[PDB]
Design a protein around this motif. Structure first.
Motif, PDB file in Angstrom:
ATOM      1  N   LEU A   1       0.814  -1.196   0.000  1.00 29.75           N
ATOM      2  CA  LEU A   1       0.000   0.000   0.000  1.00 29.75           C
ATOM      3  C   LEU A   1       0.857   1.259   0.000  1.00 29.75           C
ATOM      4  CD1 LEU A   1      -2.586  -1.081   2.768  1.00 29.75           C
ATOM      5  CD2 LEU A   1      -2.845  -1.255   0.261  1.00 29.75           C
ATOM      6  N   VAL A   2       0.939   1.957  -1.142  1.00 26.22           N
ATOM      7  CA  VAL A   2       1.772   3.139  -1.287  1.00 26.22           C
ATOM      8  C   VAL A   2       0.924   4.369  -1.544  1.00 26.22           C
ATOM      9  CG1 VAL A   2       3.788   4.191  -2.374  1.00 26.22           C
ATOM     10  CG2 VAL A   2       3.637   1.703  -2.105  1.00 26.22           C
ATOM     11  N   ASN A   3       1.272   5.500  -0.912  1.00 25.60           N
ATOM     12  CA  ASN A   3       0.644   6.784  -1.162  1.00 25.60           C
ATOM     13  C   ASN A   3       1.102   7.416  -2.483  1.00 25.60           C
ATOM     14  OD1 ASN A   3      -0.408   6.479   1.458  1.00 25.60           O
ATOM     15  ND2 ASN A   3       1.211   7.737   2.403  1.00 25.60           N
ATOM     16  N   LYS A   4       0.173   7.894  -3.335  1.00 31.63           N
ATOM     17  CA  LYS A   4       0.515   8.637  -4.541  1.00 31.63           C
ATOM     18  C   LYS A   4      -0.303   9.912  -4.631  1.00 31.63           C
ATOM     19  CE  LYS A   4       1.068   7.922  -9.681  1.00 31.63           C
ATOM     20  NZ  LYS A   4       0.589   7.063 -10.791  1.00 31.63           N
ATOM     21  N   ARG A   5       0.330  11.080  -4.866  1.00 30.19           N
ATOM     22  CA  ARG A   5      -0.429  12.280  -5.170  1.00 30.19           C
ATOM     23  C   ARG A   5      -0.927  12.275  -6.605  1.00 30.19           C
ATOM     24  NH1 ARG A   5       1.426  18.751  -5.202  1.00 30.19           N
ATOM     25  NH2 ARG A   5      -0.464  19.340  -6.338  1.00 30.19           N
ATOM     26  N   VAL A   6      -2.249  12.352  -6.764  1.00 28.44           N
ATOM     27  CA  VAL A   6      -2.951  12.445  -8.020  1.00 28.44           C
ATOM     28  C   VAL A   6      -3.629  13.800  -8.027  1.00 28.44           C
ATOM     29  CG1 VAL A   6      -4.619  11.447  -9.611  1.00 28.44           C
ATOM     30  CG2 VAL A   6      -3.220   9.956  -8.128  1.00 28.44           C
ATOM     31  N   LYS A   7      -2.917  14.835  -8.527  1.00 32.04           N
ATOM     32  CA  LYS A   7      -3.399  16.205  -8.617  1.00 32.04           C
ATOM     33  C   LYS A   7      -3.774  16.813  -7.268  1.00 32.04           C
ATOM     34  CE  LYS A   7      -4.882  16.019 -13.588  1.00 32.04           C
ATOM     35  NZ  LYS A   7      -6.070  16.000 -14.471  1.00 32.04           N
ATOM     36  N   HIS A   8      -5.072  16.799  -6.918  1.00 31.84           N
ATOM     37  CA  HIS A   8      -5.630  17.446  -5.748  1.00 31.84           C
ATOM     38  C   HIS A   8      -5.789  16.492  -4.575  1.00 31.84           C
ATOM     39  CE1 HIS A   8      -8.901  15.475  -7.924  1.00 31.84           C
ATOM     40  NE2 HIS A   8      -9.218  15.053  -6.711  1.00 31.84           N
ATOM     41  N   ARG A   9      -5.339  15.233  -4.713  1.00 35.77           N
ATOM     42  CA  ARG A   9      -5.513  14.247  -3.667  1.00 35.77           C
ATOM     43  C   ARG A   9      -4.401  13.211  -3.622  1.00 35.77           C
ATOM     44  NH1 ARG A   9      -9.277  12.157  -7.790  1.00 35.77           N
ATOM     45  NH2 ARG A   9      -8.795   9.925  -8.001  1.00 35.77           N
ATOM     46  N   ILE A  10      -3.952  12.877  -2.408  1.00 41.56           N
ATOM     47  CA  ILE A  10      -3.041  11.787  -2.137  1.00 41.56           C
ATOM     48  C   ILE A  10      -3.883  10.558  -1.870  1.00 41.56           C
ATOM     49  CG2 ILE A  10      -1.282  10.831  -0.609  1.00 41.56           C
ATOM     50  CD1 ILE A  10      -0.469  13.862  -0.096  1.00 41.56           C
ATOM     51  N   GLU A  11      -3.638   9.447  -2.584  1.00 44.05           N
ATOM     52  CA  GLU A  11      -4.484   8.280  -2.502  1.00 44.05           C
ATOM     53  C   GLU A  11      -3.627   7.029  -2.398  1.00 44.05           C
ATOM     54  OE1 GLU A  11      -7.939   8.331  -5.324  1.00 44.05           O
ATOM     55  OE2 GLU A  11      -7.524   6.193  -5.683  1.00 44.05           O
ATOM     56  N   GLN A  12      -4.168   6.001  -1.719  1.00 50.60           N
ATOM     57  CA  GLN A  12      -3.507   4.744  -1.450  1.00 50.60           C
ATOM     58  C   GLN A  12      -3.683   3.772  -2.596  1.00 50.60           C
ATOM     59  OE1 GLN A  12      -4.991   1.517   1.525  1.00 50.60           O
ATOM     60  NE2 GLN A  12      -3.438   2.665   2.698  1.00 50.60           N
ATOM     61  N   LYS A  13      -2.570   3.258  -3.132  1.00 48.34           N
ATOM     62  CA  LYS A  13      -2.569   2.380  -4.279  1.00 48.34           C
ATOM     63  C   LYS A  13      -1.894   1.054  -3.977  1.00 48.34           C
ATOM     64  CE  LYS A  13      -1.868   4.294  -8.340  1.00 48.34           C
ATOM     65  NZ  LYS A  13      -3.048   3.733  -9.022  1.00 48.34           N
ATOM     66  N   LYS A  14      -2.488  -0.033  -4.501  1.00 45.12           N
ATOM     67  CA  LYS A  14      -2.084  -1.399  -4.260  1.00 45.12           C
ATOM     68  C   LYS A  14      -0.980  -1.862  -5.194  1.00 45.12           C
ATOM     69  CE  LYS A  14      -6.481  -3.120  -2.217  1.00 45.12           C
ATOM     70  NZ  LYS A  14      -7.416  -2.054  -2.634  1.00 45.12           N
ATOM     71  N   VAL A  15       0.286  -1.650  -4.823  1.00 40.23           N
ATOM     72  CA  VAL A  15       1.405  -1.924  -5.697  1.00 40.23           C
ATOM     73  C   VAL A  15       1.886  -3.360  -5.548  1.00 40.23           C
ATOM     74  CG1 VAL A  15       3.583  -1.098  -6.604  1.00 40.23           C
ATOM     75  CG2 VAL A  15       2.057   0.466  -5.347  1.00 40.23           C
ATOM     76  N   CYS A  16       1.713  -4.188  -6.594  1.00 35.99           N
ATOM     77  CA  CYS A  16       2.321  -5.506  -6.652  1.00 35.99           C
ATOM     78  C   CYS A  16       3.788  -5.414  -7.055  1.00 35.99           C
ATOM     79  CB  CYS A  16       1.624  -6.461  -7.651  1.00 35.99           C
ATOM     80  SG  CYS A  16      -0.076  -6.876  -7.165  1.00 35.99           S
ATOM     81  N   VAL A  17       4.683  -5.945  -6.209  1.00 37.16           N
ATOM     82  CA  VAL A  17       6.119  -5.982  -6.411  1.00 37.16           C
ATOM     83  C   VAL A  17       6.646  -7.356  -6.025  1.00 37.16           C
ATOM     84  CG1 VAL A  17       6.663  -3.540  -6.291  1.00 37.16           C
ATOM     85  CG2 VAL A  17       6.478  -4.884  -4.155  1.00 37.16           C
TER      86      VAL A  17
END
Lengths: 155, 95, 66
Positions: free
Chosen positions: A73-89
């Motif tokens: 679970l990694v935080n990414k800023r997408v313009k106006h919002r920081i959102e949690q994304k499910k990164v498979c590694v």
RNA sequence: CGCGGGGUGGAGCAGCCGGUAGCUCGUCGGGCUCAUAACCCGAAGGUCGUCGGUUCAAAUCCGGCCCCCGCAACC
RNA sequence: GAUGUUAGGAGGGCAAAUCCGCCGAAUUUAAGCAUAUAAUUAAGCGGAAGAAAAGAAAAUAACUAUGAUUCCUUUAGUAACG
RNA sequence: UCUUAACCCACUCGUCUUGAAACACGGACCAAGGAGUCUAGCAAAUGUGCAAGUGUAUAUGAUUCUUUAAACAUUUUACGCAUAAUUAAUGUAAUAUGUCCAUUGUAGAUUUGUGCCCCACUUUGCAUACAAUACCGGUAAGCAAAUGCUUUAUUGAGUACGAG
RNA sequence: AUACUGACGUGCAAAUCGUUCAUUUCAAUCACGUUUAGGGGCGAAAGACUAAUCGAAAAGCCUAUUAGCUGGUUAUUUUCGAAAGAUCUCUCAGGAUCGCUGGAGUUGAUUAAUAUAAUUUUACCAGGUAGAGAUAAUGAUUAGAGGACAGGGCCUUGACCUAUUCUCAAACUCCCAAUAGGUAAAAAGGGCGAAAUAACUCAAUUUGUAUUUCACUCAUAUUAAAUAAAAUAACUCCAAGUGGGCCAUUUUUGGUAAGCAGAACUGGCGAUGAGGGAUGCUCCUAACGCUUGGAUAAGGUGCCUAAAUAUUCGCUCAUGAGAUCCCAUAAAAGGUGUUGGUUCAUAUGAACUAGCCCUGAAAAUGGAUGGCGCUAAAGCGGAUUACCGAUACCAAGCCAUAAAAAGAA
RNA sequence: CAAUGUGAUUUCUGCCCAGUGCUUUGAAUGUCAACUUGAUGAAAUUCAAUCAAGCGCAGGUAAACGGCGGGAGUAACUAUG
RNA sequence: GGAGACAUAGCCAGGUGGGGAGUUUGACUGGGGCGGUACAUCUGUUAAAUAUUAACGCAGAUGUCCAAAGACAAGCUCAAAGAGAACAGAAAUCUCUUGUAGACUAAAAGGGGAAAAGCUUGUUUGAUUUCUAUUUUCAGAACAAGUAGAAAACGUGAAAGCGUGGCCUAUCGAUCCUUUAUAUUUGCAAAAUGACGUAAAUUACUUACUACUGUGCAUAUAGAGGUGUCUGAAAAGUUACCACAGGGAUAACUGGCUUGUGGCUGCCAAGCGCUCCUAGCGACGUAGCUUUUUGAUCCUUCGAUGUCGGCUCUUCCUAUCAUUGGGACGCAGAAGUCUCAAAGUGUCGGAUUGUUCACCCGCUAAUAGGGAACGUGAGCUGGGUUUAGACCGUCGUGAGACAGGUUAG
RNA sequence: GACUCGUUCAUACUACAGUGGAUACACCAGAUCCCAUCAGAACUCUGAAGUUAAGCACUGUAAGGCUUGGCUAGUACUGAGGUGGGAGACCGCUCGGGAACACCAGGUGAUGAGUCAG
């Protein structure tokens, strides 16, 4: 724009100096799983479960583990919002994070301080130092240990 | 690009085991005069006026995806298998 | 003549105007993406725990109530 | 996409009619005339486009492609 | 089948809202446009009445069935067409 | 109040326009008229009435017959939408007691208690959120003498003591 | 009806008038009667003519056709208050959907704290730009020196080796920043234990795992580093406007350059002003209810023009002196003009140096430190004080809005 | 009679039928529809088959539309060819 | 009389058919068109050390290819250099030694890769069926490309393991439509089509019991046939005969910024100048000035600022051509040249041109150079460029086009 | 003393020398069988005759490399500020942060688990 997957190869994907095929035994074996924070770092060796560019050097929580895969679970800023994304590694890409280790050492040390205080029934504070302003001090200075300074002529 | 004419592989029907299939090239059926859309196309076309139904006069591609028809030799049932867009296809040639 | 090309101007300031939002789902990550087999084993465990609990709860309520 | 036809020495083209593939031209040499030349010979020379088969013998006939250009439907 | 200033009679024309017959478009819509749409509408030529038209089953159902027409409420913006 | 003065300030209004005092455009002057509406169908909001129903539709009735072209009434158990869903479609369509009962968690409004009030413990646990299981229709897979089944997958504008 | 492109050109006239010129017994001219009608006629042909009307007449109707385009679009106070990015579009004057806006509601906030924060702290990271390198690699790239095959005529010239050597790249990288960026800082959780549950795991249904039930217990009177008019926060709904931007510093790409084209970060302007910058959309100071008083800011203080012909030490004379960011020019090059230095030589001769001032320094209505003027400055460089100086700031009043107190004899 | 072109006299009006046209022949001819006929199927159907014009092949045609290149080799100097 | 069941006429059917009809004739674009594709994409760089980021930026690449160049195992080590072997020193060889990758990895550039991802060999077909959580681009939709797994069946090693195509970053396509796979699932609307199947019963219009039932059409699911103007119209030209809606969001005109280019002035000192750097010059360089050229440009004006030239007529500049006063000279005189204060004063007659410009002839004191909205259209003129008629050439099938010529307006 | 499995992955590398071989490693001996190649070279298998000559262990060398530290240098560079300076190019200053190469000095490994012999 015109953005394929690995763009910025000469930047981020470039190997560390003389680091080729590093795959020794200790690399694998860490095991803190579902609660743990974990860094996502590129490996020069492993192309198979390499992340997208953005996730390099970022940190986030493990939410799922498989045979040699890790969901993070990694935080990414997408313009106006920081959102949690499910990164498979992959297992080679994940590196155990050290922020937890700072909290744990402080908890253990404070716990020892608490335990000591409790045995004495003491009233004292286990809270971190502020690195406050320096108090008064003293030094005895002979004429030999003091040096006269001045600006320098051009030379 | 070249395939042999037989393949031992999973059948998705009846037999669970890997078994032999014959491999051949699909090439699209000739259209029916009984199809409902063809009937509609005929109806719209009939009487005065022009037409819209499938035509393109500015074609981009010189190539087609190849899809192989695989026929299970055990249970006598067929399956499609799709693979890359090619200019050049070969059957059974070897090297 | 030409229309604009790059510009990303004012967007950071607009983002900071309404504040840069952050997620707040928090606890209990859920459903389909949970580990196959292991979570079904957990479901069976939970069902077991629930059965033992239900047996205790039913007996305790019924004996006192009537 | 389904119908018809052409690919043969360096060039032009006969052979497509199953009993064994040539003929001009340009080249290369030689006769013939006291001339030049025109004329007449002898040479060279081709996986018969690629591939599968019918028997005593197949470039040729059956089987199917590739490269060429004619008819088309589609509209 | 003609002919008749034969005897008795009729039709013609005007008006048109509602009504009925033919004949019969385009602007428009699709952000274009050719199918579809506008529209079996507008214009055009005809015929009626105080209302006309429709009407006594070559009907609907598949029910424990209904039973000339018109109209309203409805089905229904649905089956369906594109 | 009106009136000049004098000091200080004060560029044609409207306009489209990045930018109008403009060498951008409209305006000789005054009066009166002069431009987000109405219907249809849909939505949320809020008010209002009733509630697992609701809306009297068309229509009939009357000591209704200046007003009355609405107001009033509904026979001395139609239709719309909501009451379970799903689906190409035949179809199929239980969270179950075998104290009216009996869905599981974690936060969470409210309540009980304790030690003339806030409290700190406990106590009960709505709404809602975040989940969890079931189970129903579709679709799989596995089995299959059907009240077709099945641990297990999936999918739906789903359901878990009706809200319209 | 050829020419005077005459007169006329708000006419006598929607083609007139004057003068000139062509036509006159024939393919002649004129009348009257007659024919052919609108995608139709008629045309010795000019798209000519068809009633002042013609590359499709006139009349009426379909019709209030249509329009991403132009113009217009009406009382007041008060409140919150933008966009000129993005994505898809037969798309670049538009539309849709995101963003940013308003309303409406719910949630929970009142406990000086927790959620929370364009921030720092301490941990913890990620980097290959600035930089730096060529003797680390790559691409370059200038020289000689020392060596054991080649070219020229035992020698010379080379190549080639070896130590060296000069300059290099932002499209090269040994090494390598600052700035900016990410994760972290405990009570719905964490500790150490027991017991439970399994169809996972492992010989090992307490081997681990995960979950659960019971425990025992972690700082917190204020605190698990600071700091915070941190709930004005969340969250849901419905809808609006907007989708052309433009300006500045710093970084920056193209282009000789551009008030040119294109960006990055931030702040402005736009939509917003008061005071200064003579003047001025963007520079500086500073953002505004209505008033009174105060003290200042930017900025000034000879007069225009409010405050000093202030003080104090320098420098400066100009036959076009010079005068404040954005701001509206001036360079290489000189100067036995003056002023400081500094290196040298023998209270004198050289050489440099940088301050001012001067030459270098030409242009269109008359002309511009804003103007007059100013040289014991009112110029240029300091420093010392005083004074004047905004609607900002302080104190007070008053207005409305917001929130908080507080109330049902 | 209709359809065209060039435009007194005087003088001449070359070459080319590939291309596009127009036009002519066809017991060799490639393709080419409705119908009809036959075959097939239980029927619907599905197939074959035939002697249309047309196009194509083959000619004719430039006072039809129209058009009118490039090299080499070559004359007792150079040059031109 | 003549022709005659053929004509003809009707209805079908093929052809011919700009005679006639209706319609189409992209977008980006430093104007538009031509040209290009920056319109779907992928790499490095621009890019400002996370991420983001453009221009007709730069360096490029794409529409494939591969039964192996796919899969797994096993074995091996390459480019190159030296020294050897009659053949490769010197057309694709042989050996030993040295050899960190200087090879190779289909292409395309960069990354990654040495008991291998290279090379050799063996055995092979997972380039499989079904399903998620997701990541890239992103609205956090699609598709496409990926990642991590899972339910199957297998492959390979057999030993762990690994395999859901290609070492990684690039190699591509919705709905409707068409077409073929698949099913113990369906439909074709009052009924039926395997089958009187299987049993019994038979005074018959008998009664039960059966999981798998006509042609044709329709589905559902899964692929494939295509949309490169690449989130997907069945689409050519032309208008100087034109109409209308808008446009300074966009050309041609002044002005404006800039001043490349044009024009003008410099500094230097290698040479030239008999000797002599500088009387006169001045290369190779380097610094400015101007807007008297043309660009670059697109800020201003598109609900009209009248688009060339000439004439007339006046004013201003100086960068002085002559005239005045001078300085210098390579100035003997006479000429004449460079030059300073100087705009007081002057700067012509014609030939040819639509013409600025140009090019002559003649006089002369010299016949200088420029500004004033490219001085000067309610001052004129209207010859030219630039309305509609017409002509020739080229180009265009054509309509027509022609910063081609020509006549008339 | 030695080995085996390792760990960190050059202090662990490379070059040239020297010193050491109880037990051990290895070089060495052979090809019937298992096996494998043109080739017992390698690989497999079976031996155990010799030997430190190499590998191996250890050290040495005005060794090279690597590796820490100083020093380069508060230089270069750099965030924010400034109606600061400079005609322009650019350069100071306030508040802050701050390199690299070269050069010099030091160093040349440490270590978990198991075994065997002394």
């Amino acid at each position: 724009k015109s953005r394929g997957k690995r763009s910025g190869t000469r930047y981020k994907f470039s190997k560390k100096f003389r680091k080729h095929g590093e795959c020794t035994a200790n690399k694998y074996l860490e095991k803190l799983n579902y609660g743990d924070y974990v860094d996502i770092v590129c490996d020069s060796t492993q192309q198979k479960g390499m992340p997208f560019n953005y996730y390099h050097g970022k940190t986030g929580k493990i939410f799922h583990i498989t045979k040699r895969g890790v969901g993070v679970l990694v935080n990414k800023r997408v313009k106006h919002r920081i959102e949690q994304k499910k990164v498979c590694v992959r297992i080679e890409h994940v590196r155990k994070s050290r922020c937890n280790e700072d909290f744990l050492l402080r908890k253990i040390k404070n716990a020892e301080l608490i335990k000591e205080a409790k045995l004495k029934n003491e009233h004292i504070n286990i809270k971190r130092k502020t690195e406050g302003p320096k108090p008064a001090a003293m030094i005895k200075v002979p004429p030999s240990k003091i040096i006269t300074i001045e600006p320098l002529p051009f030379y | 690009v070249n395939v042999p004419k037989t393949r031992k592989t999973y059948c998705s029907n009846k037999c669970k085991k890997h078994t032999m299939h014959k491999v051949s090239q699909y090439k699209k059926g000739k259209e029916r005069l009984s199809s409902l859309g063809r009937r509609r196309y005929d109806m719209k076309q009939k009487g005065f006026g022009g037409q819209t139904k499938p035509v393109f006069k500015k074609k981009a591609k010189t190539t087609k995806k190849i899809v192989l028809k695989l026929e299970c030799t055990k249970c006598k049932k067929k399956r499609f298998q799709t693979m890359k867009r090619c200019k050049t296809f070969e059957m059974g040639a070897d090297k | 003549a030409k229309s604009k090309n790059h510009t990303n101007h004012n967007q950071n300031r607009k983002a900071h105007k309404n504040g840069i939002k952050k997620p707040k789902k928090h606890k209990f990550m859920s459903r389909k993406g949970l580990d196959p087999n292991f979570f079904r084993n957990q479901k069976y465990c939970l069902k077991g725990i629930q059965k033992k609990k239900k047996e205790l709860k039913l007996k305790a309520k019924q004996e006192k109530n009537n």
